[PDB]
Amino acid sequence: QCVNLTTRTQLPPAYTNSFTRGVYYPDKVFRSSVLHSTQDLFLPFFSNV
Amino acid sequence: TAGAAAYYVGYLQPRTFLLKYNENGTITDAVDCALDPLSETKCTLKSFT
Amino acid sequence: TESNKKFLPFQQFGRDIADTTDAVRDPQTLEILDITPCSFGGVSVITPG
Numbered sequence: 001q002c003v004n005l006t007t008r009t010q011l012p013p014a015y016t017n018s019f020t021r022g023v024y025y026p027d028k029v030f031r032s033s034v035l036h037s038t039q040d041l042f043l044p045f046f047s048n049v
Numbered sequence: 050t051a052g053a054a055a056y057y058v059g060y061l062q063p064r065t066f067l068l069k070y071n072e073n074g075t076i077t078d079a080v081d082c083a084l085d086p087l088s089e090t091k092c093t094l095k096s097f098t
Numbered sequence: 099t100e101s102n103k104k105f106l107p108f109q110q111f112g113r114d115i116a117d118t119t120d121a122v123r124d125p126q127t128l129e130i131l132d133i134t135p136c137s138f139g140g141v142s143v144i145t146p147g
């Protein structure tokens with residue numbers, strides 16, 4: 001049984017530089033293939049996270 | 050009450066990356082083509098050097 | 099043939115440069131099998147007139 005206690009006063013959020021984060025795997029195995037271009041939704045490097 | 054905690058949030062964008070697979074099938078390094086002229090040059094040649 | 103490729107728990111196949119399948123994992127037994135093409139080559143007939 002939830003009770004109402006939340007407070008919602010404003011606060012200035014902080015930022016930081018997200019670098020080289022947010023890359024995930026494909027389905028199959030690619031072995032020692034130095035390159036494989038892939039187009040998808042990612043997190044651009046050095047972004048304001 | 051729930052003590053203290055923090056977390057980071059970022060929003061994805063549609064990007065095309067270039068992935069390097071290690072001998073053991075691991076994505077050790079990646080390159081983002083739209084980050085800067087050098088990275089886009091790296092993407093165009095399909096090489097990291 | 100028997101092969102030593104570190105397949106991830108969710109990874110099944112292994113792709114070549116030319117999109118051809120090379121390594122698989124037997125559904126019955128989780129051992130990793132490596133596929134190779136059967137021996138082939140050119141034939142050249144040396145003939146006097």
Ligand SMILES: *[C@@H]1O[C@H](CO)[C@@H](O)[C@H](O)[C@H]1NC(C)=O
Nearest residue numbers: 032070071072073074075104
């Ligand atoms: C793959 O894993 C083995 C496990 O010992 C390790 O020795 C080897 O260096 C790894 N390969 C690479 C390219 O790091």
